[PDB]
């Protein structure tokens, strides 16, 4: 519901094994601390500082082929070897969010072409579109300038997927070890906000209008007038509101489908879909007949009604919240094996 995944270079530690960390001190015991200027160390620190007690890190690179397709900014599926690339996250079924900090340190250092870094992000999107529950956070070229990032999204990448979030301006974070401002992508920090949400107001509330604590300054400050040419197209933004610190503005997913624009709905559904399939585990068991199809309908209904109990649904009463149908009509006699079908609903969007 809140645990995060990170892929990047970090000195020492196991290579391409997705270890689990829960505290910043646990991280430093495995993969150093800020040494070498790798962005993963800063990104995790912003995540840990911004709430979120769980985190998965996939170290791929090493201290110094420092950067390539699989080694460095990992992009290969690893041939489903469960030990290489984004395939390592496949055998988890717990991670709900993924990010790519180092993916674009190579772009700054020139070791990866822009056309080369487009594919790996798309490969990441294909990963999210496959597992069906996690959401990926995407980051734009550094110093992109406001009037040019809008071109970049619609011409270079054009991802158009229901599992991607974009946050334009970078962050001048503060390193406590040296007290020097450094530029870092907001992939790690934004993921921290999404962790606070579930643990403070539930998945219902969209992860926005929250302090990006850990931040100091924002490169290329964006005015409101320029934002309205950015927000509708499917790009979020970070702004420095006077007297209120740094806040995340915009909760739109990287999709063109009008029914899945808002972030929380996609955040809700992944939580909602993963809740019931954990519950209704009657599979390779319980004879498919006119009795089971009635059993499924009651079990799903007894959960959605309880979900309306905490808000996060519309209708003033349970009868007008969901609409389930698992009767004989949906299961033809021909469906001997590919059976047990059902429908369901949930909706409570944001502003």
């Amino acid at each position: 519901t809140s645990v995060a995944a990170f892929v990047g270079l970090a000195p020492t530690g196991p290579l391409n094994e997705p270890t689990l960390v829960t505290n910043w001190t646990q991280y430093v015991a495995a993969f150093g601390d800020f040494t070498g200027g790798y962005y993963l160390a800063h990104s995790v620190y912003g995540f840990f500082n911004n709430g979120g007690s769980a985190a998965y890190v996939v170290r791929v690179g090493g201290s110094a082929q420092a950067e390539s397709a699989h080694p460095g900014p990992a992009q290969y599926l690893g041939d489903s070897s469960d030990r290489t690339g984004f395939g390592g996250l496949e055998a988890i079924d717990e991670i709900s969010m993924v990010a790519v900090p180092d993916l674009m340190a190579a772009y700054q250092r020139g070791a990866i072409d822009l056309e080369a870094v487009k594919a790996v992000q798309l490969g990441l999107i294909a990963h999210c579109e496959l597992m069906g529950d996690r959401v990926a956070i995407i980051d734009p070229p550094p110093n992109q300038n406001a009037r040019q990032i809008r071109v970049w999204r619609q011409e270079t990448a054009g991802y158009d997927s229901k599992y991607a979030a974009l946050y334009y301006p970078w962050i001048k974070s503060f390193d406590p070890a040296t007290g020097q401002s450094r530029l870092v992508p907001p992939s790690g920090h934004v993921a921290g906000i999404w962790a606070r949400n579930d643990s403070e107001r539930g998945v219902h509330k969209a992860p926005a209008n929250e302090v990006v604590r850990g931040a100091v300054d924002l490169e290329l400050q964006i005015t409101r007038g320029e934002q309205d040419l950015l927000n509708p197209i499917g790009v979020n933004c970070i702004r420095s509101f006077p007297g209120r610190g740094i806040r995340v503005w915009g909760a739109r997913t990287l999709s063109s489908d009008p029914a899945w624009r808002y972030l929380n709905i996609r955040r809700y559904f992944n939580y909602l879909e993963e809740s019931i399939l954990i519950g209704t585990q009657w599979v390779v068991f319980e004879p498919n007949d006119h009795n089971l199809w009635a059993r499924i309908r009651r079990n799903v209904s007894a959960f959605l009604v309880n979900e309306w109990r905490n808000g996060a649904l519309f209708g003033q009463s349970p009868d007008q919240a969901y609409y389930v149908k698992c009767d004989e009509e949906t299961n033809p006699p021909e469906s001997v094996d590919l059976g047990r079908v059902v429908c369901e609903i949930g909706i409570a969007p944001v502003k």
């Binding site: 003033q316 009463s317 009868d319």
Partner: protein
């Protein structure tokens, strides 16, 4: 006249208007009461003064065989959360000829209870759902 037209208790007609509750099958407890207040005249033994005070109408228990149209009454009862509707109701007594003896009507109604069927593998009967109904006054 004409050997009279004596009332009976087997022929009837029971119905609720508005929500598609349809026609019922049995009634009980149709009654009106007045709560008298008793005052003991101190200086005069021999009785206690009886003085009327208000009128009160008791609830009615209507029963019918359980039919697939019982989804309506359950929906009507569970409509309190989003607003209820009170349609006029009719209770009438009839002779075998089908001619009116005394037709009462309930000005405004309201569900009170719904005792569902008493399922039993042994007893040989027919399920009789019970719909208790509130009351406001007789129509004229």
């Amino acid at each position: 006249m004409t050997r009279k037209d004596p009332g009976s208790s087997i022929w009837f007609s029971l119905a609720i208007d508005g929500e598609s509750l349809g026609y019922f099958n049995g009634c009980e407890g149709l009654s009106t009461q007045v709560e008298v207040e008793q005052r003991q005249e101190g200086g005069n033994n021999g009785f206690v003064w009886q003085l009327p005070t208000r009128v009160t109408y008791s609830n009615i228990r209507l029963t019918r065989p359980l039919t697939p149209d019982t989804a309506k009454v359950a929906k009507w009862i569970s409509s309190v959360q989003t607003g209820i509707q009170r349609p006029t109701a009719q209770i009438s007594a009839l002779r075998a000829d089908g001619s009116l003896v005394a037709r009462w009507g309930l000005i405004d109604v309201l569900p009170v209870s719904w005792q569902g069927p008493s399922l039993d593998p042994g007893s040989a009967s027919v399920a009789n759902e019970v719909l208790e109904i509130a009351h406001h006054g007789f129509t004229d």
